[PDB]
Amino acid sequence: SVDGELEALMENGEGLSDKNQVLSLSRLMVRIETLEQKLTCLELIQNTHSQSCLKSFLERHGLSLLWIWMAELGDGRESNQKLQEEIIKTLEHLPIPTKNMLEESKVLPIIQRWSQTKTVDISDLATKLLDSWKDLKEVYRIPKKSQTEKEN
Amino acid sequence: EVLDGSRVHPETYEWARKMAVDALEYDESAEDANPAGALEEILENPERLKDLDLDAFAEELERQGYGDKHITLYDIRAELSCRYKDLRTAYRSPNTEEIF
C-alpha cells in the first residue's frame, strides 16, 4: 500500500535519509493519487534536511511530480490551498540549481497562475517561490529554432 | 579524448561539447551525463547537429566576450559532421592531355 510505505518513510522523522528512501518516495509519488498522500510526501520532503536527497528527488522527475499534483487541483480552488501550502513549502525547500529544470517540468507557469488566482496565503507562498530561481547556475541552450533545413 | 581526431582546436573544445549536448538535447540532470558520451553518440548520429541555431550561439559567445565566432562554429559543425574530412580534391585519372 502507498499509504503504508509512505508512513514507513515518515518513521525516522528526519525526512528521506538515503538514496533508497528517495527512490522509494519517487516510486510512491509515481503511484500517489489522494490528498493526504500528497500532503504527507510534501511534509516529508520539507522535513528532509538532506540536500543530496532533495536533489535526487528533483533528478527523479521531482518537479514534474509536483507539477502533476498541482495540475489535478485546477487553476483556482480554496480547499486546494491546503495542498498548495504544502506544495509551495516543499518547492521553496527544494534546492533547484538550474532555471531550465523549471521550463522542462512546467512548475513555474502554475506558480505564476496561482499567485494571480485570489491559513497560509498561497499568493505569498507563490511569490516567495519566484525569486530563488533567478540565481540559478549559468546555462544557455543553442536554440533549435533554426530555419536552415538540416543541411539536406 | 575524441576531438583529437578533429580540427576543433583545443580552444574550441569546450564549445564543441556544448554543441553536441545541445544538439542531442541530452540529459542535464546530473554530472554523470558526461559530454564524451554525447560526442560519441552525435558522432554516430550527425543529423542531430544539423538543426541548431548556431548564429544565436555565436551571439552568446559575443555576449560572453569572445568576439565573433560565426565562422568558427560553422567549422565545428562541419568537424562533427565528418571528422578530419580530408579536403584534397577527389583523386581522378590523368586527363588524356595530361597523359600525352
Swiss-Prot record, chain A:
- Role this protein plays: Histone methyltransferase that specifically trimethylates 'Lys-36' of histone H3 (H3K36me3) using dimethylated 'Lys-36' (H3K36me2) as substrate. It is capable of trimethylating unmethylated H3K36 (H3K36me0) in vitro. Represents the main enzyme generating H3K36me3, a specific tag for epigenetic transcriptional activation. Plays a role in chromatin structure modulation during elongation by coordinating recruitment of the FACT complex and by interacting with hyperphosphorylated POLR2A.
Record remark: domains: The low charge region mediates the transcriptional activation activity.
Q: How does it assemble?
A: Specifically interacts with hyperphosphorylated C-terminal domain (CTD) of RNA polymerase II large subunit (POLR2A): binds to CTD heptad repeats doubly phosphorylated on 'Ser-2' and 'Ser-5' of each heptad. Interacts with HTT. Interacts with IWS1. Interacts with p53/TP53; leading to regulate p53/TP53 target genes. Component of a complex with HNRNPL. Interacts with TUBA1A; the interaction is independent on alpha-tubulin acetylation on 'Lys-40'. Interacts with STAT1.
According to its UniProt record, in which tissues is this protein expressed? Ubiquitously expressed.
Superkingdom of the source species: Eukaryota
Query: What is the name attached to this protein's record?
Result: Histone-lysine N-methyltransferase SETD2
Known disease link: Renal cell carcinoma: Renal cell carcinoma is a heterogeneous group of sporadic or hereditary carcinoma derived from cells of the proximal renal tubular epithelium. It is subclassified into clear cell renal carcinoma (non-papillary carcinoma), papillary renal cell carcinoma, chromophobe renal cell carcinoma, collecting duct carcinoma with medullary carcinoma of the kidney, and unclassified renal cell carcinoma. Clear cell renal cell carcinoma is the most common subtype. Luscan-Lumish syndrome: An autosomal dominant syndrome with a variable phenotype. Clinical features include macrocephaly, distinctive facial appearance, postnatal overgrowth, various degrees of learning difficulties, autism spectrum disorder, and intellectual disability.
Q: Which family does it belong to?
A: Belongs to the class V-like SAM-binding methyltransferase superfamily. Histone-lysine methyltransferase family. SET2 subfamily.
Instruction: Write out the biased-composition intervals (Basic and acidic residues).
Output: 131-152
The entry's comment on post-translational modification says:
May be automethylated.
Cell compartments where the protein resides: Nucleus; Chromosome
Membrane-spanning regions, if any? none
From the entire protein, which fragment is shown? 1714 to 2035 of 2564
**Consequence when changing residue 91 to S:** In AML; uncertain significance; somatic mutation
Swiss-Prot record, chain B:
Tissue spec. comment: Ubiquitously expressed.
Q: Where in the cell is it found?
A: Nucleus
Subunit-level organization = Interacts with RNA polymerase II and the DRB sensitivity-inducing factor complex (DSIF complex), which is composed of SUPT5H and SUPT4H1. Interacts with KDM6A. Interacts (via SH2 domain) with SETD1A. Interacts (via SH2 domain) with POLR2A phosphorylated at 'Ser-2'. Interacts with IWS1, AICDA and PAAF1. Interacts with histone H2B and H3. Interacts with WDR43.
Could you say which protein family the record assigns here? Belongs to the SPT6 family.
Q: What does this protein do?
A: Histone H3-H4 chaperone that plays a key role in the regulation of transcription elongation and mRNA processing. Enhances the transcription elongation by RNA polymerase II (RNAPII) and is also required for the efficient activation of transcriptional elongation by the HIV-1 nuclear transcriptional activator, Tat. Besides chaperoning histones in transcription, acts to transport and splice mRNA by forming a complex with IWS1 and the C-terminal domain (CTD) of the RNAPII subunit RPB1 (POLR2A).
Name of the protein: Transcription elongation factor SPT6
Protein species of origin:
Homo sapiens
